[PDB]
Description:
Elements: E1 5-11, E2 18-21, H1 25-34, E3 45-49, E4 54-60, E5 63-67, H2 68-71, E6 87-89, E7 94-98, E8 115-119, E9 125-130, E10 135-143, H3 144-147, E11 154-156, E12 162-172, E13 175-183, H4 184-191
The structure holds ligand SV6 and zinc ion.
Binding site for Zn(2+) 2: 109, 111, 157, 161
Binding site for Zn(2+) 1: 109, 111
Protein name: Genome polyprotein
Amino acid sequence: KGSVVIVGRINLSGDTAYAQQTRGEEGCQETSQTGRDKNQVEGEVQIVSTATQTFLATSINGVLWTVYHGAGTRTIASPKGPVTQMYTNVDKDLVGWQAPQGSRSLTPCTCGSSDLYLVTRHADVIPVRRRGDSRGSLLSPRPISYLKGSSGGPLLCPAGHAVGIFRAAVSTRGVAKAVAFIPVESLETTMRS
Length: 193
Ligand SMILES: *[C@](O)(C(=O)NC1CC1)[C@H](CCC)NC(=O)[C@@H]1[C@H]2CCC[C@H]2CN1C(=O)[C@@H](NC(=O)[C@@H](NC(=O)c1cnccn1)C1CCCCC1)C(C)(C)C
Ligand SMILES: [Zn+2]
């Protein structure tokens, strides 16, 4: 097995979103195998790694959420050693840990806006137009490479509240046309029986 390892962070507090890498490929390979990570955590969105993949994870209501197809049943490396998952929902493709010390949690969106904002792993903020429970159109199509690594990141309100967790793109010939996401309501259902 192995722990998922925070290799970075996205800050959404200020006027513009930015990414910081805080750990390289060699130091991440090391920390996955110990499960002990003494680095300072900050931000709403974390950049996380397994042995194969690098993607996002997002704190909402005190829980760091990401995708199950990326994270699996893995522990997360922390300053007190490896932390077990608090929630595992394979049906909803959703796993969550106790939000790490240092982090900030997003609030669930209560406004029902269909104007969403996808935060990518490069801290690009892309407008998405909500279409149903779990889908949204891209106002501009992108190469899927643009979104590769963003699984686990948030879709936001215009108010900066969590609408959902990005998990997949609908793609034709390497051009993403839409995004699929885990709605924040599903995260709420997961905590609430
Ligand atoms: C995300 O996990 C990530 O950042 N991973 C780190 C980089 C390694 C990653 C982000 C991709 C934009 N997500 C995925 O890889 C997801 C996962 C979760 C669900 C299945 C796999 C594949 N996947 C995708 O996003 C794919 N999308 C699809 O398979 C969609 N299907 C189509 O687009 C399609 C199918 N038939 C004909 C034409 N188009 C399905 C559609 C239904 C909902 C699930 C996604 C790719 C093709 C990788 C974009
Ligand atoms: Zn809202």
